[PDB]
From a paper:
Lamins represent a distinct class within the intermediate filament (IF) protein family. Lamin A (LA) and its splice variant lamin C as well as two closely related lamins B1 and B2 jointly form the lamina, a meshwork of ~3.5-nm-thick filaments located at the inner side of the nuclear envelope. Like for the whole IF family, the basic constitutive unit of the lamin filament is a rod-like dimer which results from a parallel coiled-coil (CC) structure. In line with this, the primary structure of lamins reveals a central α-helical domain responsible for the CC formation which is flanked by non-helical N- and C-terminal domains called the head and the tail respectively.
In addition, a construct comprising residues 1–49 of the Gp7 protein (N-terminal cap) fused by LA residues 327–403 was prepared. The last chimera additionally included a F40C point mutation, located at heptad repeat position ‘d’ within the Gp7 cap. This mutation was made to introduce a disulphide bridge in order to facilitate experimental crystallographic phasing, since the initial location of a disulphide from anomalous diffraction data is substantially easier than of isolated sulphurs. The crystal structure of the Gp7F40C-LA 327-403 fusion construct was established to 2.9 Å resolution. To this end, experimental phasing on sulphur atoms could be used, which had been facilitated by an engineered disulphide bridge in the dimeric Gp7F40C cap. Crystallographic data reveal good electron density for the capping motif and the lamin part up to residue 381, i.e., exactly the predicted end of the rod domain. The tail domain part (residues 382–403) is disordered in the crystals. While the LA 305-387 structure becomes increasingly disordered towards its N-terminus, our fusion with the Gp7F40C cap provides for a proper stabilization of the LA sequence. As a result, the CC geometry of Gp7F40C-LA 327-403 reveals an unwinding that is in line with theoretical expectations for a stutter. First, the capping motifs used (and especially the Gp7F40C cap that had been additionally stabilized by a disulphide bridge) provide for the correct assembly of dimeric, registered CCs even for short lamin fragments.
Author numbering:
A (entry chain A), B (entry chain A): 278 to 381
The structure:
């Protein structure tokens, strides 16, 4: 996490202050440089992590899409099962009628 | 997108250079301040957008989970449908036998 702009200013003031000792001036300069570098690292990290979460979210959805596709196939299978039984149950309805007429 | 650390250095050098005119020194100081502020804005933007993509990815998955749950319910329904037909088809098998014995 980078310094808030208020804080980065306090460091610039010190750095740009000819009243403070050149040892403090130099320490400030370092903090400036490190805090900047830090912010740039966070930039690179978060840009990579955003892209990463994107590819990951999309990948995980595609897992659920193929899971759903698996379910649809099972669903069409239960239709084939249901149809097979139905064609026979109907055939038996026809039959039981014929035997009821013939024998009554 | 923030300046690469190499570039941020070129600006610090100018800023900290007593040989260059105080007008350039001041312009550099501004660029420093703006580029820093810029990086901090990108920080805030990307932290918010990462959290946002997170809540969004999780929300979209929960949409597919409830879509799948809808499918499971339809699947259990096709079992109730299938069972109902099966109990009757079996009852007819018993019946057609009885009529085949009684009348042959
Ligand atoms: Cl068909
Ligand atoms: Cl049962
Ligand atoms: Ni620091
Ligand atoms: Ni800085
Ligand atoms: Ni600039
Ligand atoms: Ni800076």
């Amino acid at each position: 996490m980078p310094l808030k702009p208020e804080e980065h200013e306090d460091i610039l003031n010190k750095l740009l202050d000819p009243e403070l000792a050149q040892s403090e001036r130099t320490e400030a300069l370092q903090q400036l440089r490190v805090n900047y570098g830090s912010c740039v690292s966070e930039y690179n990290d978060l840009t990579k992590s955003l892209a990463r979460e994107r590819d990951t979210s999309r990948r995980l959805l595609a897992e659920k899409e193929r899971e759903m596709a698996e379910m649809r196939a099972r669903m069409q299978q239960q239709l084939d099962e249901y149809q097979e039984l139905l064609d026979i149950k109907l055939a038996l309805d026809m039959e039981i009628h014929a035997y009821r007429k013939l024998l009554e």
